[PDB]
Design a protein around this nucleic acid. Structure first.
Length: 1362
RNA sequence: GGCGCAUAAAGAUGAGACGCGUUUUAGAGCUAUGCUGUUUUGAAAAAAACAGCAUAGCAAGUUAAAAUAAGGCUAGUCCGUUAUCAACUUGAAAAAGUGGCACCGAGUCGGUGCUU
DNA sequence: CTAATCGCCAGCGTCTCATCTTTATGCGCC
DNA sequence: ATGAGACGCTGGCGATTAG
């Protein structure tokens, strides 16, 4: 007959269920192919599709930029080698050959094994006089002697292969290179600037307080702490915060009307510096150049070497210093060990797997690991002392190539290169000719807006070519049209108007877009005069009046100002009554004020004729960033402004894009009107219809021309379209999955579309108060918080939200300057020094949000390091947390977690396997699936051009089905089996269809697409009138939900009996039977057969583990390169098997090599796949097979399902491992018992019913042993755990004395032994039960293969017996 | 169910760069002692190493080259790990085609009536 | 000397730049 | 005047052990 389908989707699952007219899952017998006995199997119409999570593209992408980094680096070496090609042949004919063959053994080496010279003695000489490359560096930079050409190549190539970062624009000539000089001159400048209050250092050592190995903010703390009376927020303090690379602000220093922050790290800093300085004047400016070179001298903190005047190669010479101290301290340490602890010398300087100096140098141990290892050994000796000091300062035997070199900019490398060259260009002519070429090799960097330099063979490129030449670091500015390329770079990512398909979108700083939003949001603000009788919308002239009076004067104008600065100045009304916007305006006109502040002429901007010029200018300031490009783009508008004005104009730049086109805003006109949308929003007379009313108006012409959108029925397959969506590819997998599953269901059920399709959405209806509370901007939540608390902490140290965005500071003002653990006063000084601690350890769940974070003096005052703050802290800070709770500062979840300690702390039950990304991903896949099905099912239109809804797509909140499981004793425990998905599907279906049959006048609100207004304001127009829908709507959801209940208890007051049918009189149809339908639910929930299928998918990705393993005597090793023998060079390991192949042939056996017939599973890896799939028989024969049955080759993906005996199923985990393929079908009694007993959801209600469920818990305690029995028969029937089941049973008997609840939680823990899929470890109390893996896939070979559909209804079975 | 705007929490995609790591090779290690081919001296007894290997005591140890998915052809200073995939029948691919209805039951579905 | 257990391991870290979603509430509308 | 909603390594591999 007729039917409906319910779905519950997730990044890992597709829960599907089919209900009928009577809410019962239909049963049907399905045909089975292959060559087995079961020709038919009667199964049910409910199950769940399981599949691996669709992966993001971040990883693949990272690998891609890496590839490009390596190819481009190799080419830089190739340019420099090519420059030396003709001359090196005159010096050494086979130098580059030996360098290119350096990796090879002498056995396979073409020329001499000695890299530089080929002979032995000279190589030894080089390694002697220049122990490192940095000695040669210093020598060639300093000395003006004609050195060897090969060495010049080595220095230059070492500089080039490892250039350094391009983070610092311009160039840094090693200026003072001392904190001292620049700071004295700087203090001099600050004192000369202000005779108002000059502050001196009074001899405080800067070059240790700024060179300290810690936070920039931490360095700043001590620095502002040196001169008392000077705030960290002070002009001096904010400036020294800027020198440390932080993000300061001088808006409170120079009292600017608007916010203005600067930062050295960002590249708009020069334009922002000219901008802000010309804004404050040419007065204060030198302070900032002083800060620039200051930071330049502070950058080489770990690499600062004595004095910069000793040589012209500071970095190289510094490395030499590291080498020297290293040598000395090494000889030192050796002497000391041989003196004091002579027996450990053999372990420290020889054993490589012990983190000794041998593990540090020859082993794989790190500097950090090394320090940890030798520290107690040093301090256990009487000498040392200073070596301990070098260890804490981290400069103990430091090597040369370490991790802190990520700080080295390319400017110093370029300096040593330019120096060697200028000092060596006097001998060789070619490098004197090409010194600028080489400098170009090191300096060249492809701009980000250009991207890959492709010639049309990349889906990632966008660059456009001015020529058609091979782009080199030398012809780059000309061959590449940087202009069109940057333009297309931003244009390839920006959207189009949804309304106007072929049209682009205005920038977010578009004057037309800003006018759009001000007028659209200002077209409904209604006014009621103290004498007025009815609200009346602002008139056409009035809107414009407001705009000109306030919106063009202030950055943003508040409603208090409109009432006080307009109505009293214009209407001169005693009192005002505004009916459209609260507190302040959403829309604003920022671009206009930026402009009026730059060009300083209102008349031009106010002019309408200029809007094309203006819009082109904003578009230009948005598409580009490069000063030259922007400056060139505005040469056409240079006749309208002064040169000084053109500078000010190019300095301002904008980012972002709107949502609508220009043709939509001020372009499309109406036939009867002749005016555009912008005009209508600006004036429509009596009815100031909004944007949405304008679009949806038969009275206007717009709806007619928008219906002309695009064409939905164009060439788009049932796929493609899913893979053509926006966002991450992680979603496309889930969507395709759920739809192909649905299509299979309809293909089964009478080939006609079902009545309804219900899905569950993650969107639930919060209340108004909570929605505004979680969403309060930071100064808001803080200010409301401290005003409620009453502290004058805001009065002692005031900062706006602009400089408040730092984490530990937000926590600091959130907690009112008091530690959440210690009950002490926190300090603004050691801020990054204070620790930010997670409430619930990072071991349980991943949360970086503030609901989980807390600022403390030390994180050890938390109590335990692996749990919610100890009861010692909770029972001493409960008052402060509750008081922090009354200030609306901390959340409910935070107080619950801080108090969860006294509730029982954290059990292993709080597994929390989710990552927020799986949640927004589920939201993405659900929002997408909902509107796809809504259109795949509804195809036809009526006679009045409106779509036919044969099937309705329904959106159910999670809260409804959830509360439905909770208010009818229908609980869910996921870890039991994967049926809870199908249960969610069934419940969503039943609740949905029963719901639309119960109350149809409001059904338009739930279905996707169509809707009736049916305003809920008018629904519960109570005398209280809380408003905001939200609050009204949640109350509406519970209100509609209780009509489904059996007994009605009100939070409003009194009680009410419910009709046992609760059918609707208008329908005249029984909507629900309170006596028999719950029983079909009871059966369904207790139903054994549920079609659970894991998507048999071929593994793809990386070829193998990336870790390069050493030479080894194994066949397990993979050639890293072609000729590179893994037995002599080392190679890869652990290849990932794409898919297993079933083969049958003959192999050799014994010394006589006799051919016996064998069949087995061959492991086909990814790297091998293209080659196997090309010539398969040839590949198998090469593997070592002979006479292979080609038609007896079965392709088996991962998770290939298999069955042997007593319903025992196994899934193909690999070519040599299997997975548990059975689900524990457990009756409802045990499930619900486990729920109530384990305390899964704190089962809040009325204390009475809590004790009743408790009594039921205390009574059916035999359920424990019975459950143990289900698991036992089930483990003995399928799992074959041998020892593990025994360890479990022994463990259950040992803890039979434990409280009931715990036994319930850990019995819950035990299900993982019976869980579907790969076998993983678990615990019962402290007894860790590791996993019993199936290491041989031999039993699969003569079992019964089950090829299954996506819903597992159409099964084809194969008797592996041939 | 849907837009726009403001605030907020969580995510996504693409591009340009650095720094490590790892892997082979180059950085003539030395001395005493055991096994071995011989040569070499010797009347023999007994060693001189020409070298390879095993055992103790010291010496040093920081650097470099090259590789960083195998690779691919379209040969770009490009591309190569995301999405796609049960089985079966046609197809090079794309894609199309392939599985009867009620009832009594419910341990991974069974049984019975109907009908090809 | 097999063959199943046991025990172990997995490329990482940073910076610059640009465009996109997804929910929740608030101010208007289909 | 609400808590759930998102889900959770595991397959290669070498050495240790048991027969």
């Amino acid at each position: 007959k007729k039917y409906s389908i319910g779905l519950d989707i997730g990044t890992n699952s597709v829960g599907w269920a089919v209900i009928t007219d009577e809410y019962k899952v239909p049963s049907k017998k399905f045909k089975v192919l292959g060559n087995t006995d079961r020709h038919s199997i009667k199964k049910n119409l409910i199950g769940a599709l399981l599949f691996d999570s669709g992966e993001t593209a971040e990883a693949t992408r990272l690998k891609r930029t890496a590839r490009r980094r390596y190819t481009r680096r190799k080419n830089r070496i190739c340019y420099l080698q090519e420059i030396f090609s003709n001359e090196m042949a005159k010096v050494d004919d086979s130098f580059f050959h030996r360098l290119e063959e350096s990796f090879l053994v002498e056995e396979d080496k073409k020329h001499e094994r000695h890299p530089i010279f080929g002979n032995i003695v000279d190589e030894v000489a080089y390694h002697e006089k220049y122990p490192t490359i940095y000695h040669l560096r210093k020598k060639l930079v300093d000395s003006t002697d004609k050195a060897d050409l090969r060495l010049i190549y080595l220095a230059l190539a070492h500089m080039i292969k490892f250039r350094g970062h391009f983070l610092i624009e311009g160039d840094l000539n090693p200026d003072n290179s001392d904190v001292d000089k620049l700071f004295i001159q700087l203090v001099q400048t600050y004192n000369q600037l202000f005779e108002e209050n000059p502050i001196n250092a009074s001899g405080v050592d800067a070059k240790a307080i700024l060179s300290a190995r810690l936070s920039k903010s931490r360095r700043l703390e001590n620095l502002i702490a040196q001169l008392p009376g000077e705030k960290k927020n002070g002009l001096f303090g904010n400036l020294i915060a800027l020198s440390l690379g932080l993000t300061p602000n001088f808006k409170s220093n120079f009292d600017l009307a608007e916010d203005a922050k600067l930062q050295l790290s960002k590249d708009t800093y020069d334009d922002d510096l000219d901008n802000l300085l010309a804004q404050i004047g040419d007065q204060y400016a030198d302070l900032f150049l002083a800060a620039k070179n200051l930071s330049d001298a502070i950058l080489l903190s770990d690499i600062l070497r004595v004095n910069t005047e000793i040589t012209k190669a500071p970095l190289s010479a510094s490395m030499i210093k590291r080498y020297d101290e290293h040598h000395q301290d090494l000889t030192l340490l050796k002497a000391l060990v041989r003196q004091q602890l002579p027996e450990k010398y053999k372990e420290i300087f020889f054993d490589q797997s012990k983190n000794g100096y041998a593990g540090y140098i020859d082993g794989g141990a790190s500097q950090e690991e090394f320090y940890k290892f030798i520290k107690p050994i040093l301090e256990k000796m009487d000498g040392t002392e200073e070596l301990l000091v070098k260890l804490n300062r981290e400069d103990l035997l430091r090597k040369q190539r370490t991790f802190d070199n990520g700080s080295i900019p390319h400017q110093i490398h370029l300096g040593e290169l330019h120096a060697i060259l200028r000092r060596q260009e006097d001998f060789y002519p070619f490098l004197k000719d090409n010194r600028e070429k080489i400098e170009k090799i090191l300096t060249f960097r492809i701009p980000y807006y250009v991207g890959p330099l492709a010639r049309g063979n990349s889906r990632f490129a966008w660059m456009t070519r001015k020529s058609e030449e091979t782009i080199t670091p030398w012809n780059f500015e000309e061959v590449v049209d940087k202009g069109a390329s940057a333009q297309s770079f931003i244009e390839r990512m920006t959207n189009f108007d949804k309304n106007l398909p072929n049209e682009k979108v205005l920038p977010k700083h578009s004057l037309l877009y800003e006018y759009f939003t001000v007028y659209n949001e200002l077209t409904k603000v209604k006014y009621v005069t103290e004498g007025m009788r009815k609200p009346a919308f602002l008139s056409g002239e009035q809107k414009k009046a407001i705009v000109d009076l306030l919106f063009k004067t202030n950055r943003k104008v508040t409603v208090k100002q409109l009432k006080e600065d307009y109505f009293k100045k214009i209407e001169c009304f005693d009192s005002v009554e505004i009916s459209g916007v609260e507190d302040r305006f959403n829309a604003s006109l920022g671009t206009y004020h930026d402009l009026l502040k730059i060009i300083k002429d209102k008349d031009f901007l106010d002019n309408e004729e200029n809007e094309d010029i203006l819009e082109d200018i904003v578009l230009t300031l948005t598409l580009f960033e490069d000063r030259e490009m922007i400056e060139e783009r505005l040469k056409t508008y240079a006749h309208l402004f002064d040169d000084k004005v053109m500078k000010q104009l190019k300095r301002r730049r904008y980012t972002g894009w709107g949502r609508l086109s220009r043709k939509l805003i001020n372009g499309i006109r109406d036939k009867q009107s002749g005016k555009t949308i912008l005009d209508f929003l600006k004036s429509d007379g009596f009815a100031n219809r909004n944007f949405m009313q304008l679009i949806h108006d038969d009275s206007l012409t717009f709806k007619e021309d928008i219906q002309k959108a695009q064409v939905s029925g164009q060439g788009d397959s049932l796929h493609e379209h899913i893979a053509n969506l926006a966002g991450s590819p992680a979603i496309k997998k889930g969507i395709l999955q759920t739809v192909k599953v649905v299509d299979e269901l309809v293909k089964v059920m009478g080939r006609h579309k079902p009545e309804n399709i219900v899905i569950e959405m993650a969107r639930e209806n919060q209340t108004t108060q909570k929605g505004q509370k979680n969403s309060r901007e930071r100064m808001k939540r803080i200010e409301e918080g401290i005003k409620e608390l009453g502290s004058q902490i805001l009065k002692e140290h005031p900062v706006e939200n602009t400089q408040l965005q730092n984490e530990k500071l937000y926590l600091y003002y959130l907690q009112n300057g008091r530690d959440m653990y210690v009950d002490q006063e926190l300090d603004i000084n050691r801020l990054s020094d204070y620790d930010v601690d997670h409430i619930v350890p990072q071991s349980f769940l991943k949360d970086d949000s503030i609901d989980n974070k807390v600022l403390t003096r030390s994180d050890k005052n938390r109590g335990k390091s692996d749990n919610v703050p100890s009861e010692e802290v909770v029972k001493k800070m409960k008052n402060y947390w509750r008081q922090l709770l009354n200030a609306k500062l901390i959340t409910q979840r935070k107080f619950d977690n801080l108090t969860k300690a006294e509730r029982g702390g954290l059990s292993e039950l709080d597994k929390a396997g989710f990552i927020k990304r799986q949640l927004v991903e589920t939201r993405q896949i659900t929002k997408h699936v909902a509107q796809i099905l809504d259109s795949r099912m509804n195809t036809k239109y009526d006679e009045n051009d409106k779509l036919i809804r044969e099937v309705k797509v329904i959106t159910l909140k999670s809260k409804l089905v959830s509360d439905f499981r909770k208010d009818f004793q229908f609980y869910k425990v996921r870890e039991i089996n994967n049926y809870h998905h199908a249960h969610d599907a069934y419940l969503n279906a039943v609740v949905g269809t029963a719901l639309i049959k119960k109350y149809p006048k409001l059904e338009s609100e739930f279905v996707y697409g169509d809707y009736k207004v049916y305003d809920v304001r008018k629904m519960i127009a109570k005398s209280e009138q809380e408003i905001g829908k939200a609050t009204a709507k949640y109350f509406f959801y519970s209100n509609i939900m209780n009509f489904f209940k059996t007994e009605i208890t009100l939070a409003n007051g009194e009680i009410r009996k419910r009709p046992l049918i609760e059918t609707n009189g208008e329908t005249g149809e029984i909507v629900w039977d309170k006596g028999r339908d719950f029983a079909t639910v009871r059966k369904v929930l207790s139903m054994p057969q549920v079609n659970i299928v894991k998507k048999t998918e071929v593994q793809t990705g990386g070829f193998s583990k990336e870790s390069i393993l050493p030479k080894r005597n194994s066949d397990k090793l993979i050639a890293r390169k072609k000729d590179w023998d893994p037995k002599k060079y080392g190679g890869f390991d652990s290849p990932t098997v794409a898919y297993s192949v079933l083969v049958v042939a003959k192999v050799e056996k014994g010394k006589s090599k006799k051919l016996k017939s064998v069949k087995e599973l061959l492991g086909i890896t990814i790297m091998e796949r293209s080659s196997f799939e090309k010539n398969p028989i040839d590949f198998l024969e090469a593997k070592g097979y002979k006479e292979v049955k080609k038609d007896l080759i079965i392709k088996l993906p991962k998770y290939s399902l298999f069955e042997l005996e007593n319903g025992r199923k196994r899934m193909l985990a690999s070519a040599g491992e299997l997975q548990k393929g059975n689900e524990l079908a457990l009756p409802s009694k045990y499930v619900n018992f486990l729920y109530l007993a384990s305390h899964y959801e704190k089962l809040k209600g009325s204390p009475e019913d809590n004790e009743q469920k408790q009594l039921f818990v205390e009574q059916h305690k035999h359920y424990l042993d019975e459950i143990i029995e289900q698991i036992s028969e089930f483990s003995k029937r399928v799992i074959l755990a041998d020892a593990n089941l025994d360890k479990v049973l022994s463990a259950y008997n040992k803890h039979r004395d434990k409280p009931i609840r715990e036994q319930a939680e850990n019995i819950i823990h035990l299900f993982t032994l019976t869980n579907l899929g790969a076998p993983a470890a678990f615990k019962y109390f402290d007894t860790t039960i590791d996993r019993k893996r199936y290491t041989s896939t031999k039993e699969v070979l003569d079992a019964t293969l089950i090829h299954q559909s996506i819903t597992g209804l159409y099964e084809t079975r194969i008797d592996l017996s041939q």
